[PDB]
Design a protein around this ligand. Structure first.
Ligand SMILES: Cc1nc(C(Cc2ccccc2)(Cc2ccc(NS(=O)(=O)O)cc2)c2noc(C)n2)no1
Length: 280
């Protein structure tokens, strides 16, 4: 099983059916995804060299799909296919104090113009991501790069920041969703749907951009849900039919744990359901 497409017109009843007996058919599909991609080696991520480069020792890129620092080429970051092309996203863990120069190096080399962050830095007193961009308008050195924040706009559920980066100038936009708790789901579908549509709008406005960066803490759950939502919301505009199973499957061929909880998988369905409810 690589794909379970569901006709737009069948979805409400289908999803009803999925949620029956305590999400019983849902848990089965989610369970079926469990081992996807997991036959692949993680050997470079496991070198002694690289140990301090990994936030979490069980969340490592596959050797086959890992992003490489041009060049010790090692970053915890994976290439991810999207609705439109094969290297559409780069997905990474929340930077560490000791890898934030690496992270900006990758951003520069890969021609990234848009970053999506869907974790906070510290949640319930637990560190999730370093505060890896400038704290104000003063320019900062990140290895061989200089970065300056040009603007920060704080909205209730996300904050958009514009940076200028120069090497030894590109404009970068950073879309930070602030209300998605780790291992959890946002409070509403409407919020993330609208954030997803905002980002994609700007992506469309970014001629020639490299991959879009998406990250959270480990770079798998909220990051994987974000991207799966981005992909299906495009399918809802182009197709008779949406393939939530297929999307998550695909993400898993490329990185462990993409969409990391059953509830995140349920939430993807709740999103598609509500969009279609709104249309009807
Ligand atoms: C070492 C070790 N770290 C872990 C963690 C964090 C963790 C550790 C111990 C208990 C619960 C979670 C890593 C982790 C941390 C955060 C996220 N969520 S994400 O930020 O949205 O990707 C996903 C994974 C994990 N959580 O789910 C899975 C799968 N791995 N497990 O072993």
């Amino acid at each position: 099983k690589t794909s379970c497409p569901i006709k737009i017109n069948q979805f409400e009843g289908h999803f009803m059916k999925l949620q029956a007996d305590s999400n019983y058919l849902l848990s089965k599909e989610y369970e079926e995804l469990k081992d996807v991609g997991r036959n692949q080696s993680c050997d470079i991520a496991l070198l002694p060299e690289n140990r301090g480069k990994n936030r979490y020792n069980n969340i490592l890129p596959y050797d086959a799909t890992r992003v490489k620092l041009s060049n010790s080429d090692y970053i915890n970051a994976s290439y991810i296919p999207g609705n439109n092309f094969r290297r559409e996203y780069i997905v990474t863990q929340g930077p560490l104090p000791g890898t934030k120069d690496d992270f900006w190096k990758m951003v520069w080399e890969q021609n990234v113009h848009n970053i999506v962050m869907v974790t906070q830095c510290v949640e319930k007193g637990r560190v999730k991501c370093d505060h890896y961009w400038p704290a104000d308008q003063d320019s900062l050195y990140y290895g061989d790069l200089i970065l300056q924040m040009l603007s920060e706009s704080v909205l209730p559920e996300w904050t958009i920041r514009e940076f200028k980066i120069c090497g030894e100038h590109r404009l970068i936009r950073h879309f930070h969703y602030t209300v998605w708790p780790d291992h959890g789901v946002p409070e509403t579908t409407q919020s993330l749907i609208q954030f997803v549509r905002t980002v994609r709008d700007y992506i469309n406005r970014s001629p020639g951009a490299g991959p879009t960066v998406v990250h959270c803490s480990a770079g798998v759950g909220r990051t994987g849900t974000f991207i799966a939502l981005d992909r299906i919301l495009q399918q809802l505009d182009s197709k008779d039919s949406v393939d939530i199973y297929g999307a998550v499957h695909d993400l898993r061929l490329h990185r462990v744990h993409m969409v990391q909880t059953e509830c995140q998988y349920v939430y993807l369905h709740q999103c598609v359901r509500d969009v279609l409810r709104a249309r009807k």
